[PDB]
Design a protein around this ligand. Structure first.
Ligand SMILES: CCOc1ccc(-c2c(C#N)c(N)nc3sc(C(N)=O)c(N)c23)cc1
Length: 208
């Protein structure tokens, strides 16, 4: 059922730095994840241009933002290309190793955490607001998996069942207890307006 993996050392160190470096501009996590989602949607679109059957598992290309005050969760769902088990495990499809170095080198020379996305590792900016991240993904080529990590150097992957998605990725952010501003409709609206207002795909902010 549950496999447990070690992050490579460079990723564990990055994560450790994201969780530990004093940095109040936490709101950028949302832009980085919406922008990962948009990238994932570009990919399935581009692929469906010459094989229209890949849109068989869902034709709308969109992004949903779902807050839940009770679970203390913010979920970013896209119907993008999804990941296979191999992608998930290879740093969620990322070049996280050479990226984390390129990035940590950009810090050294006067970059700040907000540029993380420039090096292909914007994903880990979720750990600015989340104590645990869960990623549920389904790629046409594979079944549905759950990836999960509360940092500490390891992640798990299991196959996921019960709420099939069809195609795409859900990043479920289990928020730190002082970061519940990001469950607020006004707050989420403002951030999207401010950081993602020209995204190629509809974004729908769910109501509670
Ligand atoms: C180390 C962080 O780098 C990441 C981590 C996750 C994503 C990602 C995210 C994110 N975040 C996402 N929502 N979907 C996908 S699909 C995909 C692929 N087909 O390979 C991804 N890589 C991906 C993108 C970059």
């Amino acid at each position: 059922e549950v496999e447990t993996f070690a992050f490579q050392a460079e990723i564990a160190q990055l994560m450790s730095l994201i969780i530990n470096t004093f940095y109040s501009n936490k709101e950028i996590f949302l832009r980085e994840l919406i922008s990962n989602s948009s990238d994932a949607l570009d990919k399935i679109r581009y692929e469906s241009l010459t094989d229209p059957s890949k849109l068989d598992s869902g034709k709308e290309l969109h992004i949903n933002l779902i807050p839940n005050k009770q679970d203390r969760t913010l979920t970013i769902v896209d119907t993008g290309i999804g990941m296979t088990k191999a992608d998930l495990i290879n740093n969620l499809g990322t070049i996280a190793k050479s990226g984390t170095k390129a990035f940590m080198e950009a810090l050294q020379a006067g970059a700040d955490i907000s540029m993380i996305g420039q090096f292909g590792v914007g994903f880990y900016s979720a750990y600015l607001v989340a104590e645990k991240v869960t990623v549920i993904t389904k790629h046409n080529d594979d079944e549905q998996y759950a990836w999960e990590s509360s940092a500490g150097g390891s992640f798990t992957v299991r196959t996921d069942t019960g709420e099939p998605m069809g195609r795409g990725t859900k990043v479920i952010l289990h928020l730190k207890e002082d970061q519940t501003e990001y469950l607020e409709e006004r707050r989420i609206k403002e951030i999207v307006k401010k950081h993602s207002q020209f995204i190629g795909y509809p974004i729908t902010l769910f109501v509670e």
